[PDB]
Amino acid sequence: MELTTRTLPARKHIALVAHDHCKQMLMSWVERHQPLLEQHVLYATGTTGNLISRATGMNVNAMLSGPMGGDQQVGALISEGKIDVLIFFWDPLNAVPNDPDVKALLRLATVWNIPVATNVATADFIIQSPHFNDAVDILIPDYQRYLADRLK
Amino acid sequence: MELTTRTLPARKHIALVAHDHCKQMLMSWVERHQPLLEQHVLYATGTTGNLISRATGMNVNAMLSGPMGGDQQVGALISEGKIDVLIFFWDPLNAVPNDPDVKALLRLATVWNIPVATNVATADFIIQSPHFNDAVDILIPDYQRYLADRLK
Amino acid sequence: MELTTRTLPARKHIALVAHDHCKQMLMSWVERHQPLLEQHVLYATGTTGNLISRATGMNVNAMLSGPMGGDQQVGALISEGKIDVLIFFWDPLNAVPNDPDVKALLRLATVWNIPVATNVATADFIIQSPHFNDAVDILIPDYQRYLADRLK
Amino acid sequence: MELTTRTLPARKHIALVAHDHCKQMLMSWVERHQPLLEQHVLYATGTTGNLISRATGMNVNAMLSGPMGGDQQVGALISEGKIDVLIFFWDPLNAVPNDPDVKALLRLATVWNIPVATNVATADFIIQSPHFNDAVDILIPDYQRYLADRLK
Amino acid sequence: MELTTRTLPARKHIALVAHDHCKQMLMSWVERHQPLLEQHVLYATGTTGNLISRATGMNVNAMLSGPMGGDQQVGALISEGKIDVLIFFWDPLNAVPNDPDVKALLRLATVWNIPVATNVATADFIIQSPHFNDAVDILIPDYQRYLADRLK
Amino acid sequence: MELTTRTLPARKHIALVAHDHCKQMLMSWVERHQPLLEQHVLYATGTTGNLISRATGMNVNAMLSGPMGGDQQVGALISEGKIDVLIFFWDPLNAVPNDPDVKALLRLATVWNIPVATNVATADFIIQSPHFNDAVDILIPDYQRYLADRLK
User: Fold this and answer.
1) In this structure, are strands F41-44 and B136-141 parallel, antiparallel, or unpaired?
2) Which of helix, strand or coil describes residue A3?
3) Distance between CA atoms of D127 and B92, rounded to whole angstroms?
4) What are phi and psi for residue B120, nearest 5 degrees?
5) Regarding beta strands B41-44 and F41-44, do their DSSP bridges make them parallel or antiparallel, or are they unpaired?
6) From A83, E18, E69, F119, which residue has the greatest number of CB atoms within 10 Å?
7) Strands A136-141 and A3-8
8) Is F71 one of the catalytic residues?
C-alpha cells in the first residue's frame, strides 16, 4: 500500500485508557507526569477519564465507558487522525468482555502508525522522547489511493 | 443493569457493511429493496458505500473502509444512537484481517439493542416488519446510571 | 459459490438460547409472546429450556446445557435444516468459557441463512414480521454441488 | 464439579477429521492401520469420509463437511456419548475459516474426556495402546447433577 | 512441506501442566503412575511442578508459572526438541488470562508432532502405550529446508 | 500484586520480529538506525534475523521462524529477563496462522513491562529516547512473592 505523511503537532492529542486492574497503575503514572500532560489535549474512556479529572483536576475529554463503546470511539478518532498518542494499559492477567474491542483498537493504532504504549516502561520512553513535545512527521497509509484501487 | 428507552425514528439510519466475498450478495439485496431503502438514510463503510451509490444512484454516507477503521466508526455511531439498523454480511467461510473489529461491531450492536442482520433471511424479515417504517421505542442500557455505579 | 433454495415451514422450529445474564430478558420476552410461541415448535439448550418450560408450561425440547455441548447440538440441527429460527441472547458484557461454541453457532446460522436475533429489538422485529407464520423460501447453499466440487 | 462414570466400548466409535493440508497425512495413517480400524465403527466429516471410503473401501459414516457444520455434528455426538475416540489432524500452519468450530470441537473432546489425537505421533500411541480394543472406564461430568444444580 | 525424522529417546522428557481447576486431577494421575514416571525426566510450569514434587518427592524441573511465561518456556523447549511428551490438562470450562499462550503451546505440540494429552483418558492411553519406554521415530517438519526456502 | 524492580542494562538486548508484509519496513528502520543498534545486542526470529544480518553484516542471534516456535522462544527470554526491548512489526492487515503465538508474545511483553514497539512511530520514539542508552529501572511483578502465595 502506498504511503503519505501526516504531522503530529507539538500539542499532542493523547488518548488515555486502562482496564480496571490497571487503573491505579495509570493514575500513578499520570500523577507523576501531570505538569507535562497539562500541556497537551487529553481524551479517555468513560471511567478512566472521570477518575483522572477527579484525581488530578486536569481537563479530560471523556468518551463512553469502554464496554459501552468507548474503545471504538477512540479507534474512530485515531482513524480520523484525531488522536496522536495512545496510552492503553490493558490487563494482561484477566480476560475482559470487550476483548475484541481491545484487539481492534490496538490493530488500528498499529495501522495508523501512531505512538502506542501498553505498559509503563513504554509510556515513560515515549513521553521522555524528544518529539513528544515537538511537531514531527510520520508515514501513514494513503487512504485515498487505497480506496481508489479497491473500486477499480 | 438499569434500562431506559430510545425512539428509533420513522426514517431509520441504516448502516450497510459487507465483506468482499459478500458484496455481490449485499448489492443484490439492496437493488431488490431499493424502493424501500430510498425512503431511509443510508450509511456504509468505504468500499461497500461507493459500490452501492454507483450501482443504484442512492445517496450513501460512506465512512472509511472497514480495515482502515470503518467498522469502528460504525460502532461509535451505534453507541451514540446515530445508527438504528445494522445490516452486516460478514464472510462465514473466510477468515479476515479485521476479525476483531467485526466481533467488536456485532457486540456493540447487541449491547445497544438495535435491529441487526448478518444474513439475507434476517435482513428480509427485519425490513418487512411493520414498524420498520415507523417510530418505535427500544430498551437501551441506562448509561448514566451505569456510569454512576462505576464512579462509586 | 452455488446456491439453491429451502422452504421454511409455516410452523417454525425455533431454538431459544440465553447466557445467564440474559436469561431474564429472554424469559420476559417469551412470556410476552407466549400466545404466538404457543404455536411453532420450540427447542432450547439445557438451562434456558427447563426454565422456560417451568415458568410458562410450554413444551420445549431441551438439549444439553451450552457449556456441555448444547450450542453444538443446536448448531448441528441448524446445518441439518431442523431449526428455522434462532433466538440467541448471548451476554455482550461478560466472557464465557464456551466462547468458541458461541461464535461457531452464530457462524453456522449465518452460513445456513436462517433468521437470527441476538437482542430484543431484533427478536421483536422478526416475530412481528408478516411472513413469520407463513412458509417462506430462503436461499441456502447447495451442499451437493459444494461436496461434488470437493471430491473432483 | 460432579463426575460420574462411562464405559468406552471394546468396539469404538471413531471420528476421523482432517483439514485440507492434513488430509494426505490422515489418509496414510488410516491406510497403515486399516486392518485394525475395520474392527471399529468409523465416522468422519464429509470430505474426509468420502476420500477415505473411496480409497480404502471402508465403511465410513460421513457427516456434513466441516465448514458446513460437520465439526459441530461430531461435537454433538461426542457430548451425547456416541463418539469414543477423536482423530482430528487440524492445520497448525494455515488460516482455516471454521476456526471457532475447531476450538469448540477440541473443547468438548477435552470436557467429555475421550482419547483425542491432533497429530500422527499421538494417533499412533493411542491406537497401539493395549486397551484400544477393550472396554475402559472414563470419568465424565455428571450432567444430571450439573443441570439440577443450575436449577432450583 | 518437507518432512524429516527425529527419534524420541527411551527416557522421555515429559512436560506436565495444569490449570487450577484441573490440578487435583493431574496430581492424582501422577501419583497413580508414579512408578513409571520416575523412570523419566519431568518438567512443569511453576505452580504445577512444585505441588507435584512437594507431594510425590519426585524430581521436577519447574519453569515459570504459566501466566508469567511458563507456557511459552515449555513451547520453546518443544520446538527445540527438548520436550518429548506434553500432558496439558487445561480448563475447558473456565476462561483463563493466558488463553493465547495455551493455544500457542497446543499449536506447537501439534506442529512438532509429539504425543500430547489434554485429558485423563488420553493421558492413560499414551502412558500405557508400548513405545512409551522405547525409542521411537517421528516425522517432524524439516526446518533446515523450510528456512532455506524462506530466504530464497 | 507485589511488584519489585529490575534494571535494564545500558547495553540493551533487543528482539526484532516482523511478519512478511512488514519485513521491508523493519529492514528500512534497522538500516536507518544501524549506527545505534550496532552498540546493542540483537536477537530475532529465523527469517527476520537472517535477512537483517545478511544485509547489514551485524551480529544477530537468530531464533527459529515464528510459526515454528520462534515467537515463544522470544517470549521465554523476555520472561527470563534476557530481552530488554521488543520491536514486533506484526501485520495488522493480514491474519497469520501463529496468531495466538503473536498475542501471547505481546501479552508477556506487557506483563514484564519492557519497552514495546509495534509500529515505526513507536519504535522511533523509543530508540530516540534519551535513556535508551542508559541503565534504567523498571517495575516488574515480584515473581518470588507471586509464587509464594500460590503455594500458601
Assistant:
1) unpaired
2) strand
3) 35
4) -60, -40
5) unpaired
6) E69
7) antiparallel
8) yes
Dihedral of alpha carbons C119, C124, C130, C132, sign: positive
List CB contacts of B115: < 8 A, sequence separation 6 or more: B84, B85, B86, B126, C121, C122, C125
The Cα of C116 is separated from the nearest Cα of chain A by a number of Å equal to: 21
Show residues of chain C in contact with A97, CB under 8 Å: 91-95
Asked if residues C101 and C68 have their Cβ atoms less than 8 Å apart, the reply is: no
Could you give phi then psi for residue F55, rounded to 5 degrees? 165, -30
> Where in the sequence numbering do the catalytic residues of A fall?
71
Q: Residue F146, Cα to own-chain centre: how many angstroms?
A: 24
Name beta bridge partners: F14: F42, F85
Cβ separation F93–B97 shorter than 8 A: yes
HEC secondary structure over chain D:
CCEEEEEECCCCEEEEEECHHHHHHHHHHHHHHHHHHCCCEEEECHHHHHHHHHHHCCCEEECCCHHHCHHHHHHHHHHCCCCCEEEEECCCCCCCCCHHHHHHHHHHHHHCCCCEECCHHHHHHHHCCHHHHCCEEEEEECHHHHHHHHCC
* Cβ-contact C150, C1 below 8 angstroms: no
Whether chains D and A touch (3+ CB pairs under 8 A) is answered by no
CB contact under 8 A, F119 and A114: yes
Using CA atoms, how far apart are residues B103 and B110, in angstroms rounded to an integer? Answer: 11
Instruction: Tell me if residue B99 falls in helix, strand or coil.
Output: helix
Q: At A63, give phi and psi (nearest 5°).
A: -100, -165
Q: Which residue has the cell 443510508?
A: B42
Are C104 and D72 in contact by the 8 Å Cβ rule? The answer is yes
The C-alpha of B72 sits at a distance from chain A's nearest C-alpha, in angstroms, of 5
For residue C95, report the phi and psi dihedrals to the nearest 5 degrees.
Answer: -85, 150
Q: d(Cα D48, Cα D68) in Å, to the nearest integer?
A: 13
The DSSP call for residue C76 is H
DSSP code of F95?
-
The Cα of B142 is separated from the nearest Cα of chain C by a number of Å equal to 14
Q: Hey, which chains touch A, using 3+ CB pairs under 8 Å?
A: B, C, E, F
Cα dihedral across residues C123, C129, C135, C138: positive or negative: negative
Q: Which residue of C has its CA nearest to B132?
A: C125
Cβ–Cβ under 8 Å, residues D91 and D20: yes
C11/B60 Cα distance (integer angstroms)? 38
Alpha-carbon gap, residue C120 to F58, rounded angstroms: 61
Q: Give the torsion sign (CA, A65, A70, A71, A72).
A: positive
D93–F97: do the CB atoms touch at under 8 Å?
Answer: yes
Q: Which residue has the cell 458484496?
A: B23
Check C93 against A95: CB less than 8 A apart. Answer: no
Instruction: Give the integer Cα–Cα distance in Å for B44 and B66.
Output: 9
Considering only the top CATH level, what class is E1-152?
Answer: alpha beta
Query: Residue F84's closest CA among F4, F9, F5?
Result: F9
**C94-113 residues touching A, CB cutoff 8 A:** 94-95
**Contact A130/F at CB under 8 A:** yes
Q: How was this structure determined?
A: X-ray
| Strand-strand pairing, D3-8 and C61-62 | unpaired
Cited resolution, angstroms: 2.2
What sign does the dihedral F68-F72-F77-F78 (CA atoms) show? positive
Task: Choose from C3, C72, C142 for mutation: most chain D CBs within 10 A.
Answer: C72
Per the listing, cell 468420502 goes with D50
Amino acid at site A122: T
Which residue, among C76, C78, C28, has the nearest Cα to B121 in the 3D structure?
Answer: C78
